[PDB]
Design a protein around this ligand. Structure first.
Ligand SMILES: [Cl-]
Ligand SMILES: [Cl-]
Ligand code: NA
Length: 250
C-alpha cells in the first residue's frame, strides 16, 4: 500500500491545495501521499536528512543549491501562486495599475505608509527583494516604513488601521476580504507583475544521497502533477471561490 513522504511548506499547507490533490493522486496512482509542512529551510533539511522522498517548495535559489549539493535530482516547475500590493481604495499614492517598481517608488516618493512583516518570513524576504529593484534607496530607515514583526493577517490589519499599503500573498488577502463580507477597506492595487510570482517546484530526493528513497513513487507524483489533467485541476482550484494557482509545467 505504497506511501510517498513529502516535505513542504507551512504556506503550502495553509492553501489547502494538497488536501484536494492528495485523494485524487491516490485514486489515480494507488500511492498514498503523506506530507509534513514546515518552514522552507527545515523542509530542505528534511530532504538532506533523508527523512522524505520529495520536496514541494517555492524557493528557487535554495532549491538550486539543494540540487547542486546532490541532495535532489532536479527541480520540476509545476505552478505558481502570487503576491499583491494592497492599499486603501482611495489609493492616496495613486499606484493602482502601476508596475511593482513604479508603485514602490511612488509610495517612497510620496512618503506613503508601507507596512512590512519585519519577521524574516518567506513573505518578508519577498517584500525586501522587491525594494531591491527600485532605483531609489532602501526604505528601512524611513518613518513611513512600518515593520510589524507579526504575521500576515496582523500586518494587513495594521495597514488598514494606518491607511497604508502592504504586500501580501493573495491567499491571505482572499481570506481577509471574506472576513469583511467582500468589502474590506484595502483593495488589490498592484498585481500581475512577473516579479510577484511564487514559483513552485517538485524535487525528488536523490538516491545517491539517500539510497533507500522511494524515487519511483516520487517520480510518479511529478509525472502526475505535470500531466495536463492535474495542471487543469491545479488551475481550477479555488480558495473561497477565487483562483490561486496558475499551472505552468513545461
Ligand atoms: Cl507603471
Ligand atoms: Cl502569517
Ligand atoms: Na522620503
Amino acid at each position: 500500500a505504497p506511501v510517498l513522504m513529502m516535505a513542504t511548506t507551512t504556506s503550502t499547507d495553509n492553501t489547502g491545495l494538497l488536501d484536494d490533490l492528495a485523494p485524487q493522486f491516490t485514486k489515480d496512482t494507488g500511492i498514498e501521499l503523506r506530507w509534513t509542512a514546515v518552514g522552507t529551510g527545515k523542509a530542505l533539511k528534511m530532504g538532506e536528512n533523508c527523512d522524505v522522498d520529495i520536496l514541494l517548495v517555492h524557493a528557487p535559489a535554495a532549491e538550486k543549491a539543494f540540487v547542486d549539493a546532490g541532495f535532489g535530482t532536479a527541480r520540476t516547475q509545476l505552478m505558481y501562486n502570487d503576491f499583491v500590493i494592497i492599499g486603501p481604495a482611495a489609493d492616496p499614492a495613486g499606484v493602482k495599475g502601476m508596475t511593482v517598481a513604479a508603485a514602490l517608488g511612488k509610495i517612497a516618493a510620496d512618503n506613503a505608509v508601507f507596512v512590512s512583516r519585519g519577521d524574516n518570513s518567506g513573505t518578508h524576504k519577498m517584500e525586501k527583494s522587491l525594494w531591491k529593484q527600485i532605483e531609489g534607496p532602501s526604505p528601512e530607515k524611513e518613518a513611513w516604513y512600518v515593520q510589524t514583526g507579526q504575521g500576515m493577517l496582523r500586518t494587513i490589519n495594521v495597514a488598514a488601521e494606518k491607511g497604508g499599503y502592504t504586500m501580501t500573498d493573495r491567499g491571505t488577502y482572499i481570506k481577509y476580504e471574506a472576513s469583511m463580507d467582500g468589502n474590506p477597506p484595502l483593495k488589490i492595487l498592484v498585481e500581475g507583475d512577473k516579479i510577484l510570482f511564487n514559483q513552485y517546484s517538485a524535487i525528488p530526493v536523490n538516491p545517491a544521497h539517500c539510497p533507500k528513497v522511494k524515487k519511483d513513487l516520487a517520480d510518479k507524483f511529478v509525472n502526475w502533477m505535470a500531466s495536463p489533467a492535474t495542471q487543469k485541476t491545479i488551475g481550477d482550484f479555488k480558495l473561497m471561490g477565487k483562483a490561486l494557482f496558475t499551472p505552468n509545467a513545461e
